[PDB]
Paper text:
Poliovirus (PV) is the causative agent of poliomyelitis, a highly infectious disease, which can cause paralysis and can be fatal. Mature PV virions are ~30 nm diameter icosahedral capsids comprising 60 copies of VP1-VP420. Empty capsids (ECs), which are also produced during infection, are antigenically indistinguishable from mature viral particles but do not contain viral genome and do not cleave VP022. ECs have potential as virus-like particle (VLP) vaccines to replace the current PV vaccines; however, recombinantly expressed wt ECs are inherently unstable and readily convert to an expanded form.
As yields of [name]-SC6b were lower than those of PV1-SC6b or PV3-SC8 we investigated shaker flask expression of an alternative stabilised [name], termed [name]-SC5a27,42. [name]-[name] produced more D Ag/100 mL than [name]-SC6b in both flask and bioreactor expression systems (threefold and ~2-fold respectively). [name]-[name] was highly stable, with ~75% D Ag remaining at 50 °C and ~40% D Ag at 55 °C, outperforming both [name]-SC6b and BRP. Detailed structural analyses and comparison of the [name]-SC6b and [name]-[name] VLPs from bioreactor production were performed by single particle cryo-EM. Data were collected as described in “Methods”. Data processing yielded a final set of 113,853 particles for [name]-SC6b and 147,409 particles for [name]-[name], and icosahedral reconstructions of 2.4 Å and 2.1 Å resolution, respectively. The structures confirm that both [name] VLPs adopt a homogeneous D Ag conformation, with negligible or no particles observed in C Ag form. The quality of the cryo-EM electron potential maps is sufficient to resolve the stabilising mutations and confirm that they introduce no significant perturbations to the structure and do not impinge on the antigenic surface of the particle. Based on the extent of the observed electron potential map in the VP1 pockets of both [name]-SC6b and [name]-[name], a sphingosine lipid moiety of carbon length 18 was modelled into the maps. For [name]-SC6b the mutation in subunit VP4 I57V (I57V in VP0) and for [name]-[name] the mutation in subunit VP1 T41I, were in disordered regions of the map and were not modelled. However, in the presence of adjuvant, the response to [name]-[name] VLPs equalled the neutralising antibody titres elicited by IPV to 0.25 of a human dose, as observed previously for PV1-SC6b and PV3-SC8. Therefore, these data suggest that in the presence of a licensed adjuvant, [name]-[name] VLPs are at least as immunogenic as IPV per D Ag.
Author numbering:
A (entry chain A): 62 to 301
B (entry chain C): 1 to 235
C (entry chain B), E (entry chain B): 84 to 93, 99 to 309, 313 to 340
D (entry chain A): 102 to 251
F (entry chain C): 1 to 60
């Protein structure tokens, strides 16, 4: 038997919007401001845009099969000296250029591509609050596909083994381009190292076809597993 | 310019903030949505789906399919429990990795009733009665059917219905329980006993399996989104 | 009694409460006139029967891959660039009142399966698309160590549901339980589920069917057959050209 | 050097606010947290540093506590985090009333466990006046920057 | 004349001007049907009488702890996970017109008491819940130096009101003065006070009763008894199961 | 952007200030209050309660 309870609890914080209403670190892009001839300093870094370099946001997203959302990107930039015996540096400015698929990838930190006449670029000044941009839903499909049970190519009879071979589960449905990051400043006498942490927040989220969450450690961009295949601990059947 | 005064919090990046920001791709002609089946609006929808409980986490069963099967047999009646577990849906190992447990492990607070369904997978010729009991906390966990029958309970006739659902109603001192093992917000005990016994005729399997499922009721809610301990990244 | 075309079958789950339907004019991406073979292809095809034993770990099929050699449906699938279909899946498994056991039949959208190698996403097309024979789940994970001639096959572990998720949670997918003491069949009605209105049937498998023994088969003394009968529904095809002939083996 | 620090959230580490609050038995309020960040060099013979950025992550009860300054937990996909830039005005956030009870309890005349007959001495023992009614999680603080030579 | 159930008693303070009341439907956290024993448990129980001497420093009890062995109220308390009750506390202390002395009777919500050790919050459950016998205040603080077998008991100092606050300010709590020249009894009506609608009676003591000699007993020649009679009021219980049996001594 | 001019006092933290700030836990379903006895609205209510004076502060 039960009594009458005027329930007041709501599910406001468990809406799909609220569940994803957080900035999650999806990448740590390392760049160096240094003399070009050092050959150990990366004067620019190219990171392919994805949520699969980290696990937390990946697991939350992969609770579902399909998603549709706008994205907010927040860039937190940290920098430090690498040695103390080569003087100091002036405040650095960073270029973060979005290179959509097909646009020329920079080959050098100061090549023509950084003119960014058509690529969106964010110039961030060190010490300023973390840079932020928004993008709408840009999928070429009607939703993003977290899982694609297929191939980009179908091998055909009479084709050699090398031909028609494509990775399982790899489709251009998630080809979103890259971010190219450089320090715009010419080098100081001392080497400086910077990290740009990219934080992703889905907004106006819609999701479809829920899935059981990842239970074993992720292994690659796919659903493959190799290690940690025993997540359940030991517990007696009649032990409270 | 307009006189302004920057308050504390200016220039911070709160990962939970909700501010406008410039669009990096203005005038983008977004692909319109289609009516995909199975849209989900709230994570609780997933928590309200019955998922199988790994009830049998013994050394030889854990991390195999056997962990989902609890063996009954046709032995003589006893008052000893068939299975026992605590009502800690986020932290009890049998419940933590259910879909409900997985969802709850992204939240700090939970409240509401739970549904525990049990499916009998023996032969059609098998008969029996079982007792499924929820004991609210604060007393010794039921060691035998004599204690368990004093709490909330249901008598399940496996001959009649292969499936039995027991609702564990929300009863708590606090308006929400924590999603960790916590004495103050402990949720009580769930146990199963033989009411009479499993009976089979000849030429019938004398050992069979039952399966447990747990879900959240429509009164269930969660609060205080948090990161889960169920996924980690090395290096 | 469920009838489609010339086929008749004599408990039922509509996945996501959405019956299969044709593309609405407001959702149609391709502009050419679609092909709608209707009864000639929208009919029940019976796959090769598999055997449930005490030691069986489970079975899996991919749709439309499992039907690629099913008469006119297969012909239309391989003659068109684009194809769309829902399904009616009818799993048939009868036993005596003295048998026991339970099967979980799950229809999984985008049922990606884990590989067998340290190389990511390395399962080749031939193994990922076995056809009507489908594949089987394994008890444990066996890494393929052959470097010269890698198997490049799935290694789907049963308790990981073949994709690194606990099998007990697979009930979040549309599903039906065949409990031998209660029923001998499961019927799942699957709408076309995809992020597009229509896609390439040969490139992409929209649905996976996973049948797992939730309770092992037992009999007082045993093996019983399981038969899948699948009817594609609301079929549409676009982009007619010469027939696709996928590489095999 | 402690590259990160975890502080359990409480008003009892200091006395002034504690005394004012404990004028009363029960309270219910939203909270405003303001973080004032100061920094200094520890030596003069190892060069200089670039402006530091600090991560202050709220770890609610049950969320994984960081074990290293750069472990996975700092991804903070679900934990609220504030990134504060040194020299910016003190960071500030607000929280509503988050008590699992209908009010915060400044005094709890009871135990989290009741010891039961037949249990050993070690079992059933809990601190007097300690309940999860005031378990609000922790703050994990790190400097996001990689280290300078000094 | 105050009557509750079968009990009758023949100046009065309602704590916070709030009479005890049952949980409103709009404040009820638990969903199961509450148990309301009414008269069988909502009745006056008379505790063991204590003795007021010239040297007495004070006495303290905890509610519902003091009533845990009081017939059906105690049975319902130990048989239920959750319990809620107000109280009527009747302190009885009569003397002659030639006696003098005054008692302050204070009802304190969440009457936490200081320990006896350098270890914080170390008073064990058995000592924190003495039952009807209650405990006594001390004149001074004595740190317990036994490391092998620590007493783990309260050391409530009278002028610190047992919790590090000046006793003179304890009048901020609901209270009544028994001034022997004026009255021989004090009646305090305590509503259920807690941060929850209902709580565990065994874990948590909602009220403390502290009786301090504000003016020492004196007589021209002496000891006089003090008797507590407490009736739980508006009792509600939830979460029936096997009986709780707390560890003792 | 809108032309603005930062006045004196910008970027300070006055502990007595009353400004808005972002919520770290948006959409939190707050536990509703109950009618606890003895609510206090003003500290003077406590000051209006008679409390005992330590009138005799001798050495002993
Ligand atoms: C100023 C240039 C830098 C700012 C522009 C960043 C460009 C972002 C465009 C790519 C959009 C990616 C959206 C998220 C990708 C995820 O893999 C899918 N949403 C997964 O569901
Ligand atoms: C960006 C993350 C950092 C900001 C979020 C901070 C989290 C604060 C949540 C815990 C709430 C604590 C509220 C105060 C606790 C006191 O002990 C009680 N109010 C006492 O009455």
């Amino acid at each position: 038997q039960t009594r009458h309870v005027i329930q007041k609890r709501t599910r406001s914080e468990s809406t799909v919007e609220s569940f994803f209403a957080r900035g999650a670190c999806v990448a740590i892009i390392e760049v160096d401001n240094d003399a070009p001839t050092k050959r150990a300093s990366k004067l620019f870094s190219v990171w392919k845009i994805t949520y699969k370099d980290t696990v937390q946001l990946r697991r939350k997203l992969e609770f579902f099969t399909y998603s549709r959302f706008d994205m907010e990107l927040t860039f937190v930039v940290t920098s430090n000296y690498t040695d103390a015996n080569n003087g100091h540096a002036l405040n650095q400015v960073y270029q973060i250029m979005f290179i959509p698929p097909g646009a020329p990838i920079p080959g050098k930190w100061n090549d023509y591509t950084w003119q960014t006449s058509s690529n969106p670029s964010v110039f961030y000044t060190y010490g300023a609050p973390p840079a932020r941009i928004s993008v709408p839903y840009v999928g070429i499909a009607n939703a993003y596909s977290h899982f694609y049970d297929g191939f980009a190519k179908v091998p055909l009879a009479g084709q050699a083994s090398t031909e028609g071979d494509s990775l399982y589960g790899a489709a251009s449905l998630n080809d979103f381009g890259s971010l190219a990051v450089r320090v715009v400043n010419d080098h100081n006498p001392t080497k400086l190292t910077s990290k740009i942490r990219v934080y992703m927040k889905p907004k106006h989220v819609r999701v479809w076809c829920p899935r059981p969450p990842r239970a074993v450690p992720y292994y690659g961009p796919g659903v493959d597993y190799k290690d940690g295949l025993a997540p359940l601990p030991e517990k007696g059947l009649t032990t409270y | 310019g307009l006189p302004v005064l920057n308050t504390p919090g200016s220039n911070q990046y709160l990962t939970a903030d909700n501010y406008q920001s410039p669009c990096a791709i203005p005038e983008f002609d977004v692909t319109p949505p289609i009516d995909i089946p199975g849209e989900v609006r709230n994570m609780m929808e997933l928590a309200e789906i019955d998922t199988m409980i790994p009830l049998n986490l013994t050394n030889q069963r854990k991390n195999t399919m056997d962990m989902y099967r609890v063996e009954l047999n046709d032995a003589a009646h006893s008052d000893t429990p068939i299975l026992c577990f605590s009502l800690s849906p986020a932290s009890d190992p049998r419940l933590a990795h259910t879909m409900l447990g997985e969802i709850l492990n992204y939240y700090t607070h939970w409240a509401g009733s739970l549904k525990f369904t049990f499916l009998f997978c023996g032969s059609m010729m098998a008969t029996g009665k079982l007792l499924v009991s929820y004991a609210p906390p604060g007393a010794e966990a039921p060691k035998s059917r004599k204690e368990a029958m004093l709490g909330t309970h249901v008598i399940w006739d496996i001959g009649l219905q292969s499936s039995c659902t027991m609702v564990v109603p929300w009863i708590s001192n606090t308006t929400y329980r924590l999603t960790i093992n916590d004495s103050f917000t402990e949720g009580g005990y769930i146990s199963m006993f033989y009411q009479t016994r499993v009976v089979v005729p000849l030429s019938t399997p004398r050992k069979m399996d039952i399966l447990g499922f747990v879900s959240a009721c429509n009164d269930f809610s969660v609060r205080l989104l948090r990161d889960t301990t169920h996924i980690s990244q090395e290096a | 009694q469920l009838t489609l075309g010339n086929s008749t079958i004599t408990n039922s789950v509509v996945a996501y409460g959405r019956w299969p339907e044709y593309i609405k004019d407001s959702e149609a991406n391709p502009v050419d006139q679609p092909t709608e073979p209707d009864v000639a292809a929208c009919r029940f095809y019976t796959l090769d029967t598999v055997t449930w034993r005490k030691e069986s770990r489970g079975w899996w099929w991919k749709l439309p891959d499992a039907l690629k050699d099913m008469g006119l449906f297969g012909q239309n699938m391989f003659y068109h660039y684009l194809g769309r279909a829902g399904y009616t899946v009818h799993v048939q498994c009868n036993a005596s009142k003295f048998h026991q056991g339970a099967l979980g039949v799950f229809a999984v959208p985008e049922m990606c399966l884990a590989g067998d190698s340290t190389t990511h996403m390395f399962t080749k097309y031939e193994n990922a698309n076995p056809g009507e024979k489908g594949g089987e789940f394994k008890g444990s994970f066996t890494l393929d160590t052959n470097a010269t001639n890698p198997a490049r096959n799935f290694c789907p572990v049963d308790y990981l549901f073949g994709s690194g998720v606990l099998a007990g949670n697979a009930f979040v997918y549309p599903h039906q339980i065949i409990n031998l003491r209660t029923n001998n069949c499961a019927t799942l009605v699957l709408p076309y589920v995809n992020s597009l209105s229509i896609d390439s049937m040969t490139k992409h498998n929209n649905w996976g069917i996973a049948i797992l023994p939730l309770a092992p088969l037992d009999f007082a003394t045993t093996e019983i057959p399981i038969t899948l009968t699948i009817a594609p529904m609301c079929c549409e095809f676009n982009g007619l050209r010469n027939i696709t002939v996928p590489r095999t083996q």
